[PDB]
Structure formats: structure tokens, C-alpha cells
């Protein structure tokens, strides 16, 4: 597990780094598809009589 994994023995101390990501967010990402959903609301209110 020194060669397969990491785990380098330092001054009688192993080391395993942080595998945590950054989580890129905007949270206004669905602005296109939410604008899509409201279109087929009125498209299914009108146009099909």
C-alpha cells in the first residue's frame, strides 16, 4: 500500500491528502430550463383546444 496507495512514512507519521473537491456552484444554473418549463405551461393552456 505504499506503491498501490500513497501512505509515505515520514517522521514516524503517514500522509494521506484531502480528497475533498471544491463544489463549484452557481445555483441560478436552471434559469434556462425553468424558462423552458413555464413555456409548456401556457403551451398546454392555449393551443390545444
Amino acid at each position: 500500500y505504499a506503491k498501490k496507495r500513497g501512505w509515505v512514512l515520514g517522521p514516524n507519521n503517514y500522509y494521506s491528502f484531502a480528497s475533498q473537491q471544491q463544489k463549484p456552484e452557481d445555483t441560478t444554473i436552471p434559469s434556462t430550463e425553468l424558462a423552458k418549463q413555464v413555456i409548456e405551461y401556457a403551451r398546454q393552456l392555449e393551443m390545444i383546444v
Binding site: T28, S31, T32, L34, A35, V38, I39, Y41, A42, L45
Partner: protein, 154 residues
């Protein structure tokens, strides 16, 4: 607007307006009684008027007289708009309570005659979803304008 044209005295004991093989005479006006009490029809005659409607004028009068560019994506935003959404639901609640009252009534008092003796310019379907359609159209145009403006600008 109407245009007229005088007749002679040579056919005065005969039928004036000597009209012939056509069928576009019965239109454009019948002789009105505020006009035939005077010299119509034994003094002049009435004539037909249509309009020389042309292109190169019609659209440049239409699009240039009624037009607004940036109005289509304004907001009138929210403090005037959430108050309107606040108001309409409240009487629509009582409109729903009045809609409950006729449905739970449901008596065989000859219900087409029971409805005509209970006319009040009111609930059954007229004072119904008409408001709901206005609540639908107002919020959709408000929210579609809100979502497109987040998309376009940066």
C-alpha cells in the same frame, strides 16, 4: 361619411336612379330615416364609397403609430405585484365558498328553473376561473420576464 349626387327633373314621374345589371347596390347603406325624411330619394341618389387601401402606406402607419421596444421585458416589479397576488386570492376564497354553496345544494327543484329564479350575476362558472385566468397570465408573464433577464444579462 357619405357622398351624394343630384338628379334631374326629366324623369320626375318616372323611377329615378336608373340602375341596371349589378348587385352591389343593396350594400354600403340602406337609406336611413334621418336622411330620407329630407331630399332622399326623389332629389338626388346615394352612391357607394370604398377605400383605395394601399401597401407602402399601411404597414408604415401601423408599426410606427403603435410601438414600444423595451416595454416587452419590463417588470413593474414586485411590490406592486405581490400585493395584487395578495388581494385576488382573498375574495376568490369566498368565491370558492359561494361555489361550495351551490354544489352542496343540488336539489331537484327543476334545476334549470331553480337557476333562473336564483339569477344574481354571480358564481356558477362566470365569476369562476375568469379570475384564475388573470392570476395565471399575470404570474407567467412576470416570471418569464424574470427568468429571461437573468439569462441574457451576464
Amino acid at each position: 361619411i357619405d357622398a351624394f349626387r343630384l338628379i334631374n327633373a326629366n324623369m320626375m314621374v318616372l323611377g329615378h336612379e336608373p340602375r341596371q345589371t349589378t348587385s352591389n347596390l343593396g350594400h354600403l347603406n340602406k337609406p336611413s330615416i334621418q336622411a330620407l325624411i329630407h331630399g332622399l330619394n326623389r332629389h338626388y341618389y346615394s352612391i357607394t364609397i370604398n377605400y383605395r387601401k394601399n401597401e407602402l402606406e399601411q404597414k408604415m402607419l401601423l408599426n410606427l403609430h403603435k410601438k414600444s421596444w423595451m416595454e416587452g421585458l419590463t417588470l413593474q416589479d414586485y411590490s406592486e405585484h405581490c400585493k395584487h397576488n395578495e388581494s385576488v386570492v382573498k375574495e376568490m376564497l369566498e368565491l370558492a365558498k359561494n361555489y361550495n354553496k351551490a354544489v352542496e345544494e343540488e336539489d331537484k327543484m327543476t334545476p334549470e328553473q331553480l337557476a333562473i329564479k336564483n339569477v344574481g350575476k354571480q358564481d356558477p362558472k362566470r365569476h369562476l376561473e375568469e379570475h384564475v385566468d388573470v392570476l395565471m397570465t399575470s404570474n407567467i408573464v412576470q416570471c418569464l420576464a424574470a427568468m429571461l433577464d437573468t439569462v441574457v444579462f451576464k
